[PDB]
Design a binder for this molecule. Structure first.
Ligand SMILES: [Ca+2]
Ligand SMILES: [Zn+2]
Ligand SMILES: [Zn+2]
Length: 268
């Protein structure tokens, strides 16, 4: 069984599996630590989910202080459930920190070699992908719901890194908390799209006619291996956003009214 690569520390799940690879701050937030209430209780870091902005701004400031990464150096994207990956850095510092529309336009993955920035991505069920090539000082995040998964957003990131001279055998990938097969049931449209890009069987369990439980974390792991990532360079959480009702917001479990966690990565 793949060991859990994240450790809960004061409300934050830090990517402890990568502590010896390089001096980075990486992890995934939880519902704990903020001042939001109701459907957004407590650490809602999402600006586009109808929470009161003052609470989201404060929650962001709280995280910035916990991570020692000032808001002015954060980079956020306007996620659109597609496969666009953008290299970011100095000129994009501050993008989306206070207004979602100010985020990197229609982008689901971001990467950088800049040591002062904090890359961020928002989640409430979708798969958080993390990338690190320690030898090249390159870090990245990609948002993979079913659409980004089957549109091969992980491969988009890897291909861009290959063009920057980074071999796929030097890229470490982490897969964070997401909706698991215990709670995520999809139709033939999703399963077929996954079959089109996965060589071999897509792991799935039929629940009823045209209804299949699927593990999008494992689908992304398989696609990463098939894109040249070494199996031993992938770490994967088993945490389910829907099942963990005290740790995570879940778009599916909370019926579309919920907050957002952030995935984050930056140099210490
Ligand atoms: Ca296939
Ligand atoms: Zn999503
Ligand atoms: Zn579950």
């Amino acid at each position: 069984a793949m060991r859990e690569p994240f450790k809960y520390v004061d409300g934050i799940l830090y990517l402890q599996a990568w502590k010896e690879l390089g001096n980075i701050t990486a992890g995934f937030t939880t519902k704990d630590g903020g001042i939001s209430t109701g459907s957004f209780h407590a650490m809602n870091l999402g600006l586009h989910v109808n929470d009161i902005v003052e609470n989201v701004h404060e929650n962001r400031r709280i995280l910035a202080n916990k991570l020692q990464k000032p808001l002015e150096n954060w980079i956020c994207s306007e996620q659109v459930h597609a496969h666009h990956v953008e290299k970011v850095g100095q000129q994009e510092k501050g993008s989306g920190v206070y207004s979602y529309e100010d985020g990197i336009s229609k982008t689901d993955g971001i990467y950088t070699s800049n040591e002062d920035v904090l890359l961020t991505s928002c989640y409430a069920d979708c798969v958080p992908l993390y990338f690190y090539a320690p030898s090249h000082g390159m870090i990245g995040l990609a948002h993979a719901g079913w659409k980004g998964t089957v549109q091969e957003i992980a491969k988009e990131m890897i291909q861009k890194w290959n063009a920057e001279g980074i071999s796929s055998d030097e890229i470490h990938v982490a897969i964070g908390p997401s909706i698991g097969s215990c709670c995520y049931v999809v139709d033939d449209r999703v399963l077929t799209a996954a079959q089109e890009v996965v060589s071999g069987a897509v792991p799935h369990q039929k629940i009823s006619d045209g209804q299949y439980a699927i593990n999008l974390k494992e689908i992304n792991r398989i696609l990463c291996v098939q894109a040249g990532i070494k199996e031993e360079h992938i770490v994967m959480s088993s945490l389910c956003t829907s099942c963990e009702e005290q740790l995570f917001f879940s778009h599916r479990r909370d019926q579309g009214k919920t907050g957002r966690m952030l995935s984050f990565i930056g140099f210490k």
